[PDB]
Structure 1
């Protein structure tokens, strides 16, 4: 009965509290029949929510049997919306400068929609079907702290009249969202070691780039648990053709344990205290309810989708380096 929509979801006035735990899903995906985010949403809740067959069309879906609100983003980095962007840019909307400005605006809208996940969410699941940490995300994560801080008062002044609580209004988010990167396999016990290698690489990268600070930073470390899943190498229509060949003749969590190990820390109010450096240990679990979460997300979306937020995009200076260089 749940509808995979975000704009219509927030425009609500059943499952009221539900002790929900939202999970953001962003990242890049290849041209395929079923997107990676859709497959993840279908495998997590153990049901085909999105049945298979140039904007960031962010869509939500609540699972009553798991109390998880999956919010999947269609950022231009994805190859599904990018196809429609290149189609609309081919026939009728551009010169070189206009096309570059269009791509820059698309990337800015993507960053805005992503800040909507690092602002109202608990866990985050990246998508990169390469098995290699995309260093670009670093410059993206380093480009979100600027927006997460400068646009911080612009968001606090718009979520004041909300039952979110004290800590949520203080840091503008329910709690530090944990990044759980999820890479797909292409060629390859052997995977158990690759997960730890990628975890160590990502940790070192975010520590040397200041992307993972010892305080309430935009992201989290997740040292005790694991935040690097590796999918097995099915998706297209080839199972039927592979079943013809058979008809004619006649540990290692899987999308549930690897994600539940982190979802339980929010559904059980355990929190995200996975911090290092003998810090003050600020860990506000802030287990929200469907009603309160929707009340907060409505204002968050109305402000970011933006009186001054639209004027803060120029405060990035980390993704439009091409424009300044030219």
Structure 2
């Protein structure tokens, strides 16, 4: 378990080995043990992550030789672990600076998510509750637009790589498969019914928003057409070790997640691939199983990638900022057409404040004050 940046720099014992990359991302509550680490610990059957152990984003990697599967974890502001640190730093060290700080964090998370979808075969989404979050519909739409725009730079970055022919054109091993993992959280066979209902709801919502199309090539990700892609984690006494220890002390004084993931990993490890298309005329989908060195050759080049900064600045707090700026600009004419001069200035300022406001009111207020003072 080492950082992704510290792993691409450096293998001979397993250089030639067919591996399958699996990515993990989502939101996590303020808990002692993150749900992402538990997933890797249970799938690998070993304590991979031990217990009690400017930029707020991180990418970790881990390779399991017994299963030939590479795991990639992503932690960002969406996780309460990093948000706590961000708030703590903000507490020690303006309405406009905080907005920009949060916007920058969101942009960094978006860039990391974009990179994760280009170097993975299967992606998992975790959530602390069974209810589906609809904000992901907008997040995915915003990610697809950015992915379809920085495509030439990404392809030119890996142009000189032994990845293959289809990989060089699509800038990805194959259309990734998205899997969902929900937590019971005391809710509620009922589990199967809830899983089917959630699958249908997610499919319909993503289909109406055009996120999922008939052709698996233009889509950012695909979902199985006959297998299950939604898993609900039931409650257990594993979490909160203090409670488990207390219960044990009191007693002394008197499918599965692995199978759910293997049903999808086996397809990639058997060169069969993923075939999902219901447009009555399916087209062949590219697929390629690389080795450790072959995959690293492309991952290292994609991780180092000049024009991405300018292309990512066009893409959310952007809508809120634009709305606030528009409101302030519209309110400015009313105050500028209202006005010794202290009384007039105060009246104009009050009228402007009562007319409109937002996240960029200080700039407009200062501009109006300067204009009023320069006219007398």
Fold equivalence (TM over 0.5): yes
Alpha-carbon separation, structure 2, partners of 1:220 and 1:51: 34
Does the aligned pair in 2 maintain the 1:21–1:266 contact within 8 Å?
A: yes
Alpha-carbon separation, structure 2, partners of 1:109 and 1:102: 11
Structure 1 runs not aligned, ≥5 long: none
Alpha-carbon separation, structure 2, partners of 1:227 and 1:49: 29
Does the aligned pair in 2 maintain the 1:269–1:287 contact within 8 Å?
A: yes
Does the aligned pair in 2 maintain the 1:124–1:178 contact within 8 Å?
A: yes
Does the aligned pair in 1 maintain the 2:176–2:221 contact within 8 Å?
A: no
Does the aligned pair in 1 maintain the 2:23–2:122 contact within 8 Å?
A: yes
Going from structure 1 to structure 2, the CA distance change for 1:181 and 1:83 (only over 3 Å counts) comes to: same
Equivalent of 1:298, from 284, 288, 300? 300
Does the aligned pair in 2 maintain the 1:178–1:221 contact within 8 Å?
A: yes
Alpha-carbon deviation of 1:60? 0.7
Alpha-carbon separation, structure 2, partners of 1:325 and 1:25: 59
Alpha-carbon separation, structure 2, partners of 1:309 and 1:278: 40
1:10-63 Cα deviation digits (max 9, x unpaired): 433521132111011000000111101111111111111111115211101111
Of structures 1 and 2, the larger Rg is shown by: 2
Report which of the two has the higher share of helix: 2
Does the aligned pair in 2 maintain the 1:181–1:227 contact within 8 Å?
A: no
Alpha-carbon deviation of 1:312? 2.8
1:179-205 Cα deviation digits (max 9, x unpaired): 101111112311111111111111011
Going from structure 1 to structure 2, the CA distance change for 1:220 and 1:44 (only over 3 Å counts) comes to: farther
With 274-283 and 239-248 compared, the bigger mean Cα shift is at: 274-283
Alpha-carbon separation, structure 2, partners of 1:213 and 1:138: 14
Alpha-carbon deviation of 1:235? 4.5
Q: Tell me the TM-score normalized by structure 2.
A: 0.78
What residue number does 1:311 align with?
311
Does the aligned pair in 2 maintain the 1:142–1:211 contact within 8 Å?
A: yes
Does the aligned pair in 2 maintain the 1:61–1:70 contact within 8 Å?
A: yes
Going from structure 1 to structure 2, the CA distance change for 1:271 and 1:229 (only over 3 Å counts) comes to: closer
Alpha-carbon deviation of 1:216? 3.5
Query: How many residue pairs were aligned?
Result: 314
Alpha-carbon deviation of 1:265? 1.1
Does the aligned pair in 1 maintain the 2:273–2:287 contact within 8 Å?
A: yes
Structure 2 runs not aligned, ≥5 long: 234-238, 322-373
Q: How does 1:36-185 map to 2 (within 5 A)?
A: 36-53=35-52, 54-92=55-93, 95-185=94-184
Determine whether 1:322 maps to 2:320.
yes
1:164-192 Cα deviation digits (max 9, x unpaired): 11111111111111110111111231111
Higher RCO (CA-CA < 8 Å; seq separation 6+): 1
Does the aligned pair in 2 maintain the 1:225–1:261 contact within 8 Å?
A: no
Alpha-carbon separation, structure 2, partners of 1:128 and 1:285: 29
Going from structure 1 to structure 2, the CA distance change for 1:17 and 1:320 (only over 3 Å counts) comes to: farther
Going from structure 1 to structure 2, the CA distance change for 1:214 and 1:230 (only over 3 Å counts) comes to: closer
Going from structure 1 to structure 2, the CA distance change for 1:86 and 1:51 (only over 3 Å counts) comes to: same
1:123-158 Cα deviation digits (max 9, x unpaired): 000011110111011111111101110011110010
Alpha-carbon deviation of 1:239? 1.2
Matched residue SS, 2:21: strand
* Structure 1 residue runs of 4 or more that deviate by more than 4 Å after TM superposition: 217-233
Q: Tell me the TM-score normalized by structure 1.
A: 0.89
Alpha-carbon separation, structure 2, partners of 1:62 and 1:80: 24
Going from structure 1 to structure 2, the CA distance change for 1:161 and 1:136 (only over 3 Å counts) comes to: same
Matched residue SS, 2:127: coil
Alpha-carbon deviation of 1:284? 1.8
Structural RMSD (CA)? 3.5
Alpha-carbon deviation of 1:228? 6.4
Alpha-carbon deviation of 1:311? 3.1
With 47-56 and 214-223 compared, the bigger mean Cα shift is at: 214-223
Going from structure 1 to structure 2, the CA distance change for 1:232 and 1:273 (only over 3 Å counts) comes to: closer
1:218-276 Cα deviation digits (max 9, x unpaired): 75776656776676663453211121121111xxx221111011111111111111121
Going from structure 1 to structure 2, the CA distance change for 1:229 and 1:165 (only over 3 Å counts) comes to: closer
Alpha-carbon separation, structure 1, partners of 2:181 and 2:63: 21
Going from structure 1 to structure 2, the CA distance change for 1:282 and 1:231 (only over 3 Å counts) comes to: closer
